Amino acid sequence: GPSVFIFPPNIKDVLMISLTPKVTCVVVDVSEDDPDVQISWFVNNVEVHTAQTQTHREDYNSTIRVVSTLPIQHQDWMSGKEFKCKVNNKDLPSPIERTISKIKGLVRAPQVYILPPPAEQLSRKDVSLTCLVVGFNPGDISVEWTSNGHTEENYKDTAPVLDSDGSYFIYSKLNMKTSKWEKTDSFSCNVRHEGLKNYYLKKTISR
Amino acid sequence: GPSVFIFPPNIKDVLMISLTPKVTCVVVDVSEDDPDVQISWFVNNVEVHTAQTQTHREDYNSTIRVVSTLPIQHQDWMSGKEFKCKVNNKDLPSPIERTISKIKGLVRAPQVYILPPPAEQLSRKDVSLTCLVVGFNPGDISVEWTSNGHTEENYKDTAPVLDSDGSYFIYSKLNMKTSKWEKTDSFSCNVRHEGLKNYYLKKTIS
Ligand SMILES: *[C@@H]1O[C@H](CO[C@@H]2O[C@@H](C)[C@@H](O)[C@@H](O)[C@@H]2O)[C@@H](O[C@@H]2O[C@H](CO)[C@@H](O[C@@H]3O[C@H](CO[C@H]4O[C@H](CO)[C@@H](O)[C@H](O)[C@@H]4O[C@@H]4O[C@H](CO)[C@@H](O[C@@H]5O[C@H](CO)[C@H](O)[C@H](O)[C@H]5O)[C@H](O)[C@H]4NC(C)=O)[C@@H](O)[C@H](O[C@H]4O[C@H](CO)[C@@H](O)[C@H](O)[C@@H]4O[C@@H]4O[C@H](CO)[C@@H](O)[C@H](O)[C@H]4NC(C)=O)[C@@H]3O)[C@H](O)[C@H]2NC(C)=O)[C@H](O)[C@H]1NC(C)=O
Ligand SMILES: *[C@@H]1O[C@H](CO[C@@H]2O[C@@H](C)[C@@H](O)[C@@H](O)[C@@H]2O)[C@@H](O[C@@H]2O[C@H](CO)[C@@H](O[C@@H]3O[C@H](CO[C@H]4O[C@H](CO)[C@@H](O)[C@H](O)[C@@H]4O[C@@H]4O[C@H](CO)[C@@H](O[C@@H]5O[C@H](CO)[C@H](O)[C@H](O)[C@H]5O)[C@H](O)[C@H]4NC(C)=O)[C@@H](O)[C@H](O[C@H]4O[C@H](CO)[C@@H](O)[C@H](O)[C@@H]4O[C@@H]4O[C@H](CO)[C@@H](O)[C@H](O)[C@H]4NC(C)=O)[C@@H]3O)[C@H](O)[C@H]2NC(C)=O)[C@H](O)[C@H]1NC(C)=O
């Protein structure tokens, strides 16, 4: 039968008032013979009808995939409301329910550091610039890169990792040809985390 | 009913001839009223009786957990033999089978770099020393820390991450007092990966 997964809003959406946070319920392994899936959503056990639901055939493994996206209020996520999807399909004996909420806990702001490329890397044609964000709880965080107020897209973050001291760290790695690294006036590590004043810190490394 | 998960040997065991690599089959959500589970193992579809199997009650969630550990030959893993567990329990309509093997692929050796603690951290009482291992395939790697032949245990690695160029990177973070950093003669990042000459490279910093 079908499996249902529920996913939280993206922390960047949660932490910026101009963006819309969304809870996601994904149904996989739906049969092509029984494609109809009914998804109901609840906020604190009250039914809401604000979700958008898309259905798609996964041609690569002969199943249907349904995705429902519930837009939510920042205040409801932050205050700990429970967001619940309920899924009905012919292949299902009883409806499947999933619920999710922000779990209350310890809050601690990250320290943000930028580490330049290692000397041994500078003779190469490409270099990596590292942002180390350490000491934060909880381990939901957004790290993005810019260059002089221009968006940089060639970077990868690690997952947040539980450190020995009970907090989290994450490393972000921006990749660039060595000539950009010399040519450029500054680079910035843009960190969004609920532990931070104004939910935002920027750290810059200037030529 | 019960569910079964299968796990590969540790990459360090695979890459050191003196260590025994092990395939692990774990059965969870076994009922307390039917604890008996039969696990059989197969290497390329021929049955072996070399595994050690342990059962334990999980008191925190009222279920039985069974762990079968199959010791394997390095060459068997490396040459791509399939290792298979078959699990029987009274709560299974039919036996559950899981199989694993080393997947064949490109091999690329990592570059290893060590980055000193960031300048703004030197003012604090604890510092972070970073090993950046980058440019490797496949994404199975061992990274460990020493100082002067001494084992350092206060470090955490990230999992390997698939990079922009199709290769993997990992970061390893060694935590220590600022004094230790300033007084210690050397720190070494010890990397084990199948792309490396002798499956081993050590980078060292002062
Ligand atoms: C047929 O194919 C489909 C599709 O697969 C795709 O196509 C095929 C052909 C292949 O190419 C394949 O590689 C392709 O992916 C298959 O569908 C897959 O099915 C499996 C289940 O069989 C699903 O596995 C679960 O994955 C969860 C994690 O999923 C995320 O991360 C994975 C890993 O990368 C991604 O692949 C997924 O897409 C998910 O990614 C997330 O997606 C979110 C929703 O979109 C994103 O959030 C949204 O993002 C947007 C922006 O994009 C907005 O911001 C929204 O606001 C936001 O909501 C999110 O960003 C994104 N993240 C990432 C990383 O990109 C696992 O969590 C889950 O594990 C749980 O469940 C298991 C039970 O099955 C259980 O064993 C685990 O232990 C775990 O259980 C949970 O554990 C905790 C305790 O720790 C408990 O609290 C829970 O209750 C507990 N649950 C239970 C009940 O025990 C699964 O591993 C897989 O996700 C799914 N893929 C896709 C793409 O949907 C299908 O299987 C194929 N069928 C056949 C027959 O072969
Ligand atoms: C009752 O409790 C038990 C026990 O849980 C514990 O106690 C409870 C009370 C809680 O406190 C809890 O927090 C505790 O953990 C519960 O048991 C759990 O059940 C879930 C599913 O219900 C299992 O989830 C799967 O996890 C896999 C990953 O497992 C590792 O990682 C987690 C977290 O990091 C660890 O907790 C686990 O222990 C696993 O850790 C690994 O264990 C290995 C073997 O022991 C180690 O390797 C060995 O290492 C030793 C050294 O020690 C030697 O070196 C050996 O040589 C070596 O072999 C290994 O190092 C270690 N790693 C780490 C990081 O520690 C997931 O892979 C898996 O996902 C798959 O399956 C899902 C199906 O359910 C599916 O949805 C997913 O999509 C995914 O599916 C597969 O995807 C792959 C690609 O990855 C595809 O190729 C496949 O096709 C596809 N298959 C399928 C079928 O679709 C699950 O998420 C969980 O592992 C298990 N925990 C334990 C401890 O056993 C139980 O659920 C509870 N019951 C109830 C009702 O509450």
From Swiss-Prot, chain A:
O-linked glycan consists of Gal-GalNAc disaccharide which is modified with 2 sialic acid residues. Residues 2-101, 110-206 form the Ig-like domain. Disulfide bonds join 25-85, 131-189. One of its GO terms (biological process) is positive regulation of type IIa hypersensitivity. The keyword Zinc does not apply. GO terms for molecular function: antigen binding. GO terms for cellular component: extracellular region; extracellular space; immunoglobulin complex, circulating; plasma membrane. Keywords: Cell membrane, Disulfide bond, Glycoprotein, Immunoglobulin domain, Membrane, Repeat, Secreted, Transmembrane, Transmembrane helix. Glycans are attached at residue 61. This is Immunoglobulin heavy constant gamma 2B. The gene is Ighg2b.
